[PDB]
Every structure is written in C-alpha cells, then in structure tokens.
Write an enzyme that holds these catalytic residues in place. Structure first.
Site, PDB file in Angstrom:
ATOM      1  N   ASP A 130      55.569  74.979  48.644  1.00 29.76           N
ATOM      2  CA  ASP A 130      55.603  76.078  49.626  1.00 29.76           C
ATOM      3  C   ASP A 130      54.802  75.648  50.852  1.00 29.76           C
ATOM      4  O   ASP A 130      53.930  74.798  50.790  1.00 29.76           O
ATOM      5  CB  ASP A 130      54.990  77.341  49.013  1.00 29.76           C
ATOM      6  CG  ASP A 130      55.393  78.627  49.734  1.00 29.76           C
ATOM      7  OD1 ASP A 130      54.947  79.683  49.266  1.00 29.76           O
ATOM      8  OD2 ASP A 130      56.134  78.621  50.745  1.00 29.76           O
ATOM      9  N   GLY A 131      55.042  76.320  51.968  1.00 27.46           N
ATOM     10  CA  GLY A 131      54.249  76.112  53.165  1.00 27.46           C
ATOM     11  C   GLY A 131      54.374  77.348  54.026  1.00 27.46           C
ATOM     12  O   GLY A 131      55.382  78.024  53.980  1.00 27.46           O
ATOM     13  N   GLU A 179      57.045  74.221  55.297  1.00 27.99           N
ATOM     14  CA  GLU A 179      57.944  74.262  54.143  1.00 27.99           C
ATOM     15  C   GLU A 179      58.521  72.874  53.911  1.00 27.99           C
ATOM     16  O   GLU A 179      58.617  72.410  52.767  1.00 27.99           O
ATOM     17  CB  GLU A 179      59.091  75.253  54.361  1.00 27.99           C
ATOM     18  CG  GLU A 179      58.650  76.724  54.380  1.00 27.99           C
ATOM     19  CD  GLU A 179      59.731  77.705  54.888  1.00 27.99           C
ATOM     20  OE1 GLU A 179      60.929  77.353  54.900  1.00 27.99           O
ATOM     21  OE2 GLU A 179      59.357  78.825  55.372  1.00 27.99           O
ATOM     22  N   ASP A 224      51.870  78.946  47.235  1.00 24.10           N
ATOM     23  CA  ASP A 224      51.691  79.914  48.324  1.00 24.10           C
ATOM     24  C   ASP A 224      50.196  80.066  48.651  1.00 24.10           C
ATOM     25  O   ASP A 224      49.786  80.066  49.835  1.00 24.10           O
ATOM     26  CB  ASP A 224      52.313  81.249  47.915  1.00 24.10           C
ATOM     27  CG  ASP A 224      51.974  82.336  48.823  1.00 24.10           C
ATOM     28  OD1 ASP A 224      52.770  82.583  49.727  1.00 24.10           O
ATOM     29  OD2 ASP A 224      50.936  82.959  48.619  1.00 24.10           O
ATOM     30  N   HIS A 272      58.201  85.198  43.368  1.00 27.93           N
ATOM     31  CA  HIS A 272      57.101  84.568  42.654  1.00 27.93           C
ATOM     32  C   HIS A 272      56.997  84.988  41.185  1.00 27.93           C
ATOM     33  O   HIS A 272      56.297  84.331  40.406  1.00 27.93           O
ATOM     34  CB  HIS A 272      55.789  84.943  43.333  1.00 27.93           C
ATOM     35  CG  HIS A 272      55.425  84.077  44.503  1.00 27.93           C
ATOM     36  ND1 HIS A 272      54.513  84.479  45.456  1.00 27.93           N
ATOM     37  CD2 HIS A 272      55.842  82.841  44.878  1.00 27.93           C
ATOM     38  CE1 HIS A 272      54.397  83.541  46.378  1.00 27.93           C
ATOM     39  NE2 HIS A 272      55.183  82.530  46.043  1.00 27.93           N
ATOM     40  N   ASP A 293      61.213  78.149  47.444  1.00 29.17           N
ATOM     41  CA  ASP A 293      61.813  79.345  48.042  1.00 29.17           C
ATOM     42  C   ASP A 293      62.106  79.189  49.535  1.00 29.17           C
ATOM     43  O   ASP A 293      62.526  80.141  50.189  1.00 29.17           O
ATOM     44  CB  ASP A 293      60.979  80.627  47.773  1.00 29.17           C
ATOM     45  CG  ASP A 293      59.683  80.697  48.573  1.00 29.17           C
ATOM     46  OD1 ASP A 293      59.432  79.838  49.428  1.00 29.17           O
ATOM     47  OD2 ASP A 293      58.897  81.662  48.358  1.00 29.17           O
TER      48      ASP A 293
END
Length: 153
Positions: A10-11, A48, A134, A124, A70
């Site tokens: 994630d980012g 991301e 996250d 999540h 995601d």
C-alpha cells in the site's frame, strides 16, 4: 517454485500531492520482511506504485510471486495500459513521456524478472497484511526521509 513469495503493498499521502509513504510486507518460507519509506513530496499514485516496485526489487532472483494490493492505479496500469505504453515507447501521441514513466519502467523490469500473480483486493477486513501496510505508509509519510526525485509536475 514449490512455494511462492507472498507480497502485500500500500502507499498513500497526507493530502495529494503531499508527504507520502509506502508499506510492503513479503512472506516466503514463513519468514517475513517489511519495507517502508517516506517522501517529502509525492502523490498517492506514485506511492502505491513505489510499494510494489520496492517489494519486487527486493527479490533479486526470479520468483513466482502473489502480490496483493488495493491500488486502483496499479491495477489499471497492469491490466489495461502497460502493454500499450511499452509498445508506444513510453510516450503518448503528443510524444510526451507517459505519466510516472520512471516508476512504471521499474515495475516493468520487475515483471520481466518475476512471474507475478496479481490479487486485486477490496477492503482491509479479510486482509491484515494490507492493513499493516496502510499503517506503515502513513507512519512513513509522517516522518519522511527521501526526496521523490521522479515527481515532476
């Protein structure tokens, strides 16, 4: 490979554009590794992508990989655009480099190296590693240490 490397990524940024960060978790043969770094000024999309890039670049030898994210931007590029971006020499019709070309070329190099199975996740709830990523992305964004040298508006 009898066993595949599992990656979660994630980012995000604190306002977009803004300080940002990524988090990535890799699990292989029951050994877990984490990567996370923060950037003074960047974008959600770039973070991301950076998360996937750094995780995949950490595997120096070819691997069979399952990568769960995601990110809509990563999914869109992988599933819709990247075949054509490459074929067009990484430029749009106006002959400008495609957006985020620096990171997409690094992702493409990783795709050449590794046999990646992408898992596009939603939410999540069933995804504890993604939730950990996250948090890593936020805490990195709260304490950046790197310039994003390719962020070039």
């Amino acid at each position: 490979m009898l066993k595949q490397v599992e990656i979660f990524t994630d980012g995000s940024c604190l306002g977009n554009p803004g300080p940002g960060g990524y988090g990535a978790i890799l699990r292989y043969k029951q050994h877990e590794k984490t990567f996370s770094a923060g950037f003074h000024l960047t974008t959600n999309n770039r973070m991301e992508l950076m998360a996937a890039i750094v995780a995949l670049e950490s595997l120096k030898q070819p691997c069979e990989v399952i990568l769960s994210t995601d990110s809509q931007y990563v999914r869109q590029g992988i599933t819709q655009w990247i075949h054509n971006w490459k074929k067009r020499g990484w430029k749009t019709a106006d002959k400008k480099p495609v957006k985020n070309v620096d990171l997409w070329q690094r992702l493409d190099a990783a795709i050449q190296r590794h046999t990646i199975n992408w898992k596009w996740v939603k939410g999540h709830a069933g995804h504890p590693e993604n939730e950990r990523c996250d948090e890593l992305a936020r805490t990195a964004a709260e304490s950046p240490t790197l310039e994003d040298v390719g962020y070039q508006p």
